[PDB]
């Protein structure tokens, strides 16, 4: 109660998040139609959601999901390996093209 | 299990970069080879 | 959980392709000298 009827569904150990209230709008636009499913949390869901009932246009609330599975490492223990591998491969290719051009 | 996935997705970019960078050397070799023979 | 397994399998596949591509380039460069 309290003109905030939208309540996200919690306590889910699966890769799937749910949103419900006691039609639907995305960013205020007509995308949803009707517990309406939202999607999996791996794909980093976003947007603006809306639910309403007998009472008039209710009051929104947004969801931020940060789950990346895409973030990489950036400390000195990894940049050194990247630089080493890239430079060694570049040197090998340079030697190869050098010789090649030697024949021609 | 987070650290292993972190390192793995670090290495995937490395290998994609290396393949896409070897493609250019293959392309530069094939042009000369076609021009010669 | 169930996504890291593809991340580990795809990197092995890309290692395989890297070996194949290096073999290709080495063979072609060796042939060019003849």
């Amino acid at each position: 109660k309290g003109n905030h009827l939208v309540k996200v569904y919690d306590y889910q150990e699966d890769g799937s998040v749910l949103l419900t209230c006691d039609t639907w709008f995305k960013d205020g636009k007509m995308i949803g139609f009707l517990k309406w499913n939202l999607g999996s949390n791996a794909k980093d869901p976003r947007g603006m959601y809306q639910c309403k009932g007998s009472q008039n246009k209710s009051k929104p609330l947004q969801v931020y999901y940060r789950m990346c599975q895409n973030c990489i490492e950036l400390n000195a223990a990894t940049i050194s390996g990247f630089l080493f591998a890239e430079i060694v491969s570049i040197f090998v290719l340079a030697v190869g093209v050098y010789f090649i051009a030697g024949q021609d | 299990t987070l650290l292993l996935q972190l390192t793995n997705t670090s290495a995937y970019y490395m290998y994609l970069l290396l393949l896409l960078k070897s493609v250019v050397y293959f392309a530069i070799i094939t042009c000369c080879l076609l021009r010669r023979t | 959980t169930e996504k890291v397994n593809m991340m580990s399998l795809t990197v092995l596949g890309l290692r395989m392709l890297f070996a194949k591509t290096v073999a290709v380039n080495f063979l072609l460069t060796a042939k060019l000298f003849f």
Binding site: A77, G81, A85 | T7, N8 | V22, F26
Partner: peptide
Amino acid sequence: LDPKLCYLLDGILFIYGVILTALFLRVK
């Protein structure tokens, strides 16, 4: 630790393979 040692082994052995292929090609 294991993945980094793994990739290091991959790289070192790959360089060894390339140089040994070159040396074998020259001698023949």
